[PDB]
């Protein structure tokens, strides 16, 4: 219980820190921009983004982000 | 403040990824987070190798943020 609770808190913390524009989603441009700051190349950034953006609308919701963890409960 | 706020963001991302509170992103905990996010293991390992510049199996904050820190 507490372990899963902590992991959800952890995922939200990562998501929120990534979400520089405070939209509640990870838009493509801000995701790319962070990857670039971390020196990850655009093809890798896009590979990871296209994967997370399940519905291909150009922004990763927290549902999409934590799909794997939430589906595992 | 713009830069200071970016540093805080990078520090927050890093802290959240360091689940075992080692001060570093060990390959194991890094990969496990990527597995959790449903990221393909080859994409995960590529991003880990990119960050782990000295190739010791753990990402320091100096390594993680070297692009930001060195552009200051
Ligand atoms: Ca956003
Ligand atoms: Ca989406
Ligand atoms: Ca660690
Ligand atoms: Ca290292």
Swiss-Prot record, chain A:
Q: Which domain of life is it from?
A: Eukaryota
Q: Which residues bind Ca(2+) 2?
A: 53, 55, 57, 64
Known tissue expression? Down-regulated in cutaneous melanoma cells but not in breast cancer cells.
Q: Where does Ca(2+) 1 bind?
A: 19, 21, 23, 25, 27, 30, 59
Q: Where in the cell is it found?
A: Cytoplasm, Perinuclear region
All residue ranges annotated as the EF-hand domain in the record = 6-40, 40-73
Disulfide-bond pairs as recorded = none
Q: What does this protein do?
A: Binds predominantly GDP, and also GTP. Acts as a dynein adapter protein that activates dynein-mediated transport and dynein-dynactin motility on microtubules.
Q: How does it assemble?
A: Homodimer. Interacts with the dynein-dynactin complex.
Task: Give the family, as the similarity comment puts it.
Answer: Belongs to the small GTPase superfamily. Rab family.
Q: What is this protein called?
A: Ras and EF-hand domain-containing protein
Q: What is the originating organism of this protein? A: Homo sapiens (Human)
What are the top taxonomic ranks of the organism?
Eukaryota, Metazoa, Chordata, Craniata, Vertebrata
């Amino acid at each position: 219980a507490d372990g899963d609770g902590e992991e959800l808190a952890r995922l939200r913390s990562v998501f929120a820190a990534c979400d520089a524009n405070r939209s509640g989603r990870l838009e493509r441009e801000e995701f790319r921009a962070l990857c670039t700051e971390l020196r990850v190349r655009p093809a890798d950034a896009e590979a990871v983004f296209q994967r997370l953006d399940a519905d291909r609308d150009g922004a990763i919701t927290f549902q999409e982000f934590a799909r794997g963890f939430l589906g595992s409960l």
